């Protein structure tokens, strides 16, 4: 059973790695967008950047919000009345960070679907010209996880125990206590008890997140 715990520790690391790497490609595009927007933040120039295929193919949309509440999104969408970019999680998140950040799941203003955002402040000579973001669907994150690995299921949880991505969408943004109340596994311990183990995801900007592996205790 030390042998099981090896395998779960080592699958946990291969999944924590494959996912850190999948995200960091995405993070770099958003950072490049913010860097590019900062070159020339005229709205025509911003729009041209957010329209390019590397962005429109990678994300559901990408956008710029600023402190006077200017907003550009591609693909373009009618936003609900008294939408304000500055109250959105991606904005507040990037505004309270000196690097790029990832949101926890929230409700898209654009599609009304459950999404996460990668966001970063666009800075020209120290000064801020706004916050750039890119949206990934909860289903996209469920798919990437399911594609990227053993003998049970992988899920994504914050250090505070908030379930972020779970193939059981009913559990998304439940805590571990609220999701597993009978016997509540702690992220404090490498292993729990259906044996669940937590690997920290190494080298994400701003966030302390884990891969949970959940298995039926067998094979
Ligand atoms: C639409 C976009 C700006 C972002 N997903 C939001 O919900 O605020
Ligand atoms: Cl526009
Ligand atoms: Na590598």
UniProtKB/TrEMBL annotation:
Compartments (UniProt record): Cell inner membrane
Domain of life: Bacteria
Family, similarity comment: Belongs to the methyl-accepting chemotaxis (MCP) protein family.
Name of the molecule in the record: Putative methyl-accepting chemotaxis protein
Source organism of this protein record: Pseudomonas fluorescens (strain Pf0-1)
Source lineage: Bacteria, Pseudomonadati, Pseudomonadota, Gammaproteobacteria, Pseudomonadales
